[PDB]
Design an enzyme around this catalytic site. Sequence first.
Site, PDB file in Angstrom:
ATOM      1  N   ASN A  66       0.816  -1.200   0.000  1.00  0.00           N
ATOM      2  CA  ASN A  66       0.000   0.000   0.000  1.00  0.00           C
ATOM      3  C   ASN A  66       0.863   1.269   0.000  1.00  0.00           C
ATOM      4  OD1 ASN A  66      -2.022   1.920   0.191  1.00  0.00           O
ATOM      5  ND2 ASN A  66      -2.580   1.411   2.303  1.00  0.00           N
TER       6      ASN A  66
ATOM      7  N   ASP B   5      -1.664  15.102  -7.422  1.00  0.00           N
ATOM      8  CA  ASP B   5      -2.192  15.562  -8.704  1.00  0.00           C
ATOM      9  C   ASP B   5      -1.908  17.046  -8.944  1.00  0.00           C
ATOM     10  OD1 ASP B   5      -4.036  16.316  -6.740  1.00  0.00           O
ATOM     11  OD2 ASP B   5      -5.724  15.271  -7.654  1.00  0.00           O
TER      12      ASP B   5
END
Lengths: 629, 629, 629
Positions: free
Chosen positions: A229, A372
């Site tokens: 993860n 992002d």
Amino acid sequence: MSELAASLLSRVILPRPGEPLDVRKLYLEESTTNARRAHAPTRTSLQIGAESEVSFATYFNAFPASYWRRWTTCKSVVLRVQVTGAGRVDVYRTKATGARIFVEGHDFTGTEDQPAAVETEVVLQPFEDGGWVWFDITTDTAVTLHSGGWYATSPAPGTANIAVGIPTFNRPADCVNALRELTADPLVDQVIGAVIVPDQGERKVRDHPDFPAAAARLGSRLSIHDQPNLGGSGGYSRVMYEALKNTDCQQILFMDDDIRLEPDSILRVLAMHRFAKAPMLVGGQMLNLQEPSHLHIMGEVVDRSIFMWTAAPHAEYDHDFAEYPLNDNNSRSKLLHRRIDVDYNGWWTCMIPRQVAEELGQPLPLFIKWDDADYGLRAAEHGYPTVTLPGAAIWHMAWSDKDDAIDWQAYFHLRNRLVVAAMHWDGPKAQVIGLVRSHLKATLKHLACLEYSTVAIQNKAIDDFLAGPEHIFSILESALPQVHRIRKSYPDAVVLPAASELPPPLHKNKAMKPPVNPLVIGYRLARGIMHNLTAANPQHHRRPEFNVPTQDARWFLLCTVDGATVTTADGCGVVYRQRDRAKMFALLWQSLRRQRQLLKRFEEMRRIYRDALPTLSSKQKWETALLPA
Amino acid sequence: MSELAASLLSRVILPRPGEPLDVRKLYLEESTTNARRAHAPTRTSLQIGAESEVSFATYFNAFPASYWRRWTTCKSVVLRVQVTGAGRVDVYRTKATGARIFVEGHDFTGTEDQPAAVETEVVLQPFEDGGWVWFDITTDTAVTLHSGGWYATSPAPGTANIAVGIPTFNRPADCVNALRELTADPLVDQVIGAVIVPDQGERKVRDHPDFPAAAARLGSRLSIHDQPNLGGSGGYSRVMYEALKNTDCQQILFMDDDIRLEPDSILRVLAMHRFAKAPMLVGGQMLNLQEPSHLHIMGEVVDRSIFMWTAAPHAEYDHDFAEYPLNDNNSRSKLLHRRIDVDYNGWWTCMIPRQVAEELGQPLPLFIKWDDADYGLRAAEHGYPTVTLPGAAIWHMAWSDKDDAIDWQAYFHLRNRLVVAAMHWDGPKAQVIGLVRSHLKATLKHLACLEYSTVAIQNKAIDDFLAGPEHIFSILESALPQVHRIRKSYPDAVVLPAASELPPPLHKNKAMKPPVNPLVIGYRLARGIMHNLTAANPQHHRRPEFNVPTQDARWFLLCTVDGATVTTADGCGVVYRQRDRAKMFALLWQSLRRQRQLLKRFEEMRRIYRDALPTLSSKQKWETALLPA
Amino acid sequence: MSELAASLLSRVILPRPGEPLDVRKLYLEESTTNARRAHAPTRTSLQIGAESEVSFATYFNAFPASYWRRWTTCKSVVLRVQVTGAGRVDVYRTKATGARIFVEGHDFTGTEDQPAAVETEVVLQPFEDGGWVWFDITTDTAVTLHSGGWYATSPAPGTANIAVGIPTFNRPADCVNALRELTADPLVDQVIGAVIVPDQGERKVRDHPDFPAAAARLGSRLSIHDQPNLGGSGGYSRVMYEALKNTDCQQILFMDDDIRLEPDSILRVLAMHRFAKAPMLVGGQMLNLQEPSHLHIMGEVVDRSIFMWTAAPHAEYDHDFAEYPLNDNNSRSKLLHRRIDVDYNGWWTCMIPRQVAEELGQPLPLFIKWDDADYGLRAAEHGYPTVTLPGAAIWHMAWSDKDDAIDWQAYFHLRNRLVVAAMHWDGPKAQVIGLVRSHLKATLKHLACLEYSTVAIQNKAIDDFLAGPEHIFSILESALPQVHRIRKSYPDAVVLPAASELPPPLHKNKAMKPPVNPLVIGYRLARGIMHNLTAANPQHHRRPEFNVPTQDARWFLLCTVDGATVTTADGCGVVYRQRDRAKMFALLWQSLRRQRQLLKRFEEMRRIYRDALPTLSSKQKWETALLPA
Ligand SMILES: [Mn+2]
Ligand SMILES: [Mn+2]
Ligand SMILES: [Mn+2]
């Protein structure tokens, strides 16, 4: 010929059978004066009764002309429809104010045997800072619209060859669905060269009963990569890593697993990428998966005054097209006619040119959040802009009700904001006061709301940012568990199944009206400060004073209690929030201590963080996290 | 008999098939309780379902009774309808307040074989200062309205013989369309004696591929006259010149090339001209070609306080009949029931009696603007009034979005205003202060908005007016190029294709709310004066501070920048506006210098301009401009 | 049996074919969710589609329960409907607040062969100060309502034998229509014993081409009596004179000639008269003949504070049932649920018991105005109340637009008010100050509006009242011509066909907003006083300053001009109003002189007027005016 197929920008599309009436508003708007509802026998055709009017001034079927003018070489667009029966195709455009302008009408008469072709070329010259183009059909006799499209006047440049990336974590059923929907539309299927799935969870998508059927339709284009993860960053980092090293795909398309897709959305994004003036990032918008006729946001920026992501200047969150049609007088709808420029797009749908990925490097090793935004800021510094394309959307969960920036995510929100701020600031020296002031106001608010753990983990966030870019990378995986460990010792972070698991509240609730009144805010504020100076009564930590619903859990109500249950944003449980004057003051002092460190050490931080970018973004350094022993 | 045909004032007309629902509101208003939409099998007939109500209280089908009372010899009007099926024709009228009054109902029963005739004479006595007459049909069984008309009780006087004039300039396709539409309706065709087309452009209408077919339907009634670009004045001057010298047409009808026509509109205008009490100008109204259900204005006047054209006292621009029905309680709709008196009508549709043209002379040799207003004022001074007739309209481009009074047109707006003011003032001596004050306020606004070229060309406008009526005539053609030449040296007048052609703006935009607040306006004003006293930073002329959209480009935002792109009103480009304190002050001083000249020399101007009217309006003097070597 | 026919109070009635949708709201209210419009094959039956709801909560079909409770012996009412198909009849009532209460539902299933009978007895106990009863039908299958009625539980007492009275004056066509409509409904025909028509005009109803056909249906029940123009009083006086002397009719029904009739209205009035607790006057309401869905007023009183007729305490003029349904939340509709008590009813529909007419005597010999109010006040003093019955109406011209209390009628308004005030005062001594103050305010307003003739004739009105009751009687006929003679010399009373008959106005009009602002009213008032102290400019009596429309002709605009045309209320002409300071002051002084006389001589007036009542109301004294030489 297939010269049509090569120049297709955006198909006219219609709802699936059984689609709720609200969602149908994204596709078509029918006059209430019509005798009957229009009927869609397929996703690309429509039957309209005699003497009826349908408008295609809609999210999916209107053409976002100003965006095409701004970012592409298309000087004009051609509307092409094929129709039977008798009626008129009326073509309209808007000014950036939303004012509608009639361009041209075309009467037609066609039969099933000899269908009518209606064509209309619209020059993109008058769309400097906003405006859409659309058509309506007003019928004489019953009409079938057999097909419709917005076309460029020349074939799309380049080669279409997309590597689609979908990081997944313990959502095998959602992932399987996403894989399935990628091959639903043959035209989307044909342009997909690879599907990279970083499987970061323990419940593998490979082990899902419906996986083999989804995997068969992709064949050898699909690859699944097991890794730990590493959050969104690690997921999308893997996607980009695999696309550059192990495929020859010309476009990299970041997507997500918990999505519903309108496949034409992908082709619109691809079309804009191919017709682009210069290489650029092309992003899709997000419709609210839980309120499917609602647009999340037209686009987002990073506000430089305090370095915080927000809605772009003339954009507002949560636009319901069923209540507020695109072509409507109201103020919310008029905003939609401005061309909204963005600093970045989210990774639910974001197309990145192969060369651009190569030059910029990988995502920053942030776990979640700001990765992002960073990639958009970085791209812009290299002369690669981002566009968020209206009418190109997927359905995804919005922060519609179910989310609260007070849990473990708050750590990542603050830490990563600081990392990206250090990476991209550029502005004046004294500009960080704005960001610290912003954080102080939020800190005092958390303490007022008894959200103590939030402050503590935000204190760790500052420490981790301050320790430098090498420490950041080293805690890609370990950061999450360490945040949970801190939160375990705060009562405000331990979720219990229900308020009924605790002793019943001392007081029943009383509706408190939100203070808009100027004097009353002051009074509530003072009352809050006064109470916070008193020693708390320990009995209110044994038995809560109130059971407070999420919607009522506001500072003005919470700053006067010693102990209360507060329901979690998702409505799934409660936490026992508890005031302690000694702990509050200690956390506040620790926060202030860190705030003063930030404004003393921020210039240094910029240097060390900018100097580490080659490292933080290199595929080789990322191999140490992505690949095992 | 054909005694009906000779007394027909206004036909009941219906929409073409495929007509958008908004535009249909100009013709008929149907109850939403009706089972089905009414169907128009032809432009003069209607099918109405059983148990349904349709109202003809509409722009095209109601009768503007008060206008007929005011200007014509018709003491009464007869409504005549032919109907089949069973139902009731209900006849209504309004007071000038908009209050509806039931006049009389008529039950009918007719069959296709034996159609029912329903007649209703309405005396025009109670319409002293406003009011319409209309009918509704409420059906028992299905009803076909086969025809309907408003009729006078006696034949139309005079002979119908119209010379239609259409100046055209580089719009061959629009001109060809106009020629085509003139012969579409046989009843309009029959009353047209000539069509004069002054072709002032280089792209000739004669060279258009569809011209021969349009020209065939007119035959020898059509004449095309090549001449230089002499603007609207030269165009319409030519029309009038040709009509008087080379035809025996009794009516001269000015039209335009970029229009859509409802042919019955022409017959309504003609009917009012023929039944007129005394010779007069009869004008049509303009519906917005880009928002086709919108009326531009009921009528216009020249406000004598500052000598400026405006909306007539109780008229407001842009009335949407689809949102605001004629017969509706709202305030905008009630205004439509007053008889609106005008000083002039525009030349998109304006009928001038032959004798009147002869007596008044030609248009003034202004290039564009104020020539229509002058011709109305001149006519009134000779006892020939103007009427703008409601329900008689063409579709034409309004200043709907696409226009801004800051370009080369500003020169002509100011110069010609001054010429016509000098020609017609009549009022007190000290009355010119009003006009100069008006211009000062506008000047300071232009400078605040950085619209520097506007001020410069307005300075030339004043100079040209001051030089006298002989200089004015001598620059009919040369004035336009000379305005362009001045504008070339101002950055605020050089249109670039996009903001993206320039360096990206220093600042992102922030939504600024328009100051309605009294204190805030003052604050923004002071902030503007303060900034305008500083030396501008030259770097903001290299790189713009903002990219400002047209809708946001207001004085309060613009008076604080040194440099910014502003998008043109039509959305087709941008201009780089640049503040320069030295240039601003110099232009302001030059303007003030001219303002003081105007109020010193205005009395002289009136004399020389009035003394030149025989010359400026003579056909012989116009021959020097209209005809070549 | 016919025991049903004898106990019928009010039939359920439906619109005629082709009835405008607005007017249909007076009868039935249909849900917009219904597939189709309900269809009325006759005036007493209705077809309702399957799965549809119609409400009979309407002006004509609901039962005004509180009125029946207040004035009649009916302890309960029975709703009886005959239905086919399957559905439910739901019965409702309201409290005086308008709150709807469900009483009882009845499911039915009937066929054309075996129709279903649905009966519902509603006790009238809970209607002490307001409330209606009504039914709705909600269908399962298609339903025909074959008939419906509200019935008493026992036969109507007395004998039905009406003498209908219709004074007529130069309206032969209207009179012929009225005569025709009286015999349209067989059930109304049967109860009419006589029709007395005092023909007071020169254009006789007897000479009308359609008279013989109307007269044939009445036979010998019709009598026409030629007499001079004695106004409304003489007309109705004649009616009552003829009914008592020359018929044995038990009810006297005053009607009017310019009316449209809903015949069941007469039966409702008659039913209430027959079931009355004690003898009383029963009046019908007036629907607006020019706005046919509008109720004029629920009822009227005489306000004792200034002795002036007004709307009853909770009643408002002009209630549009199409906009404001009886069963609707809005404030205007809720007022309709109070029982509205009246002092009198107008003579468009007023039923007077034979014995009552005998005891009270004739109308007072007033020409027009106040004669109905007097007869109501007189009746009440004899213990005979008046009821205005809701749901019982005729259509008649209201003062809807076309009337203004400034012409010759103003003389009669004031004079007769004074006569009736003297006749009925009863109140304290110092109470007349109120009436005089009322008149002063009106006087100053007339003078402000330049309505000079109005003041002059109101000065004559006071003189004529003061001269006593014998002078009043002697001028029954001569008063009208004498008022015209006074008015001829005032420019404000000479009607000209149009403003265009006069020289064009000096100034164009400017929209003046009505002063609601407290300071602004004061400012306009002062500006008015200031101007009225100046000498007027005679040139403004040659050429008007303005052409003022009726709607704009208000005191604040008019009190600043010296001369202006003002359009008459009916829109048929204009008057040249002219200010003269000398004349104004003289008229004002003459008015004040009379005002002081009134409050000095009013006590005397009461004595002489009350002492003259036997004379003024005796049939013998009336014979001197009614019958010739
Ligand atoms: Mn997701
Ligand atoms: Mn034009
Ligand atoms: Mn009457």
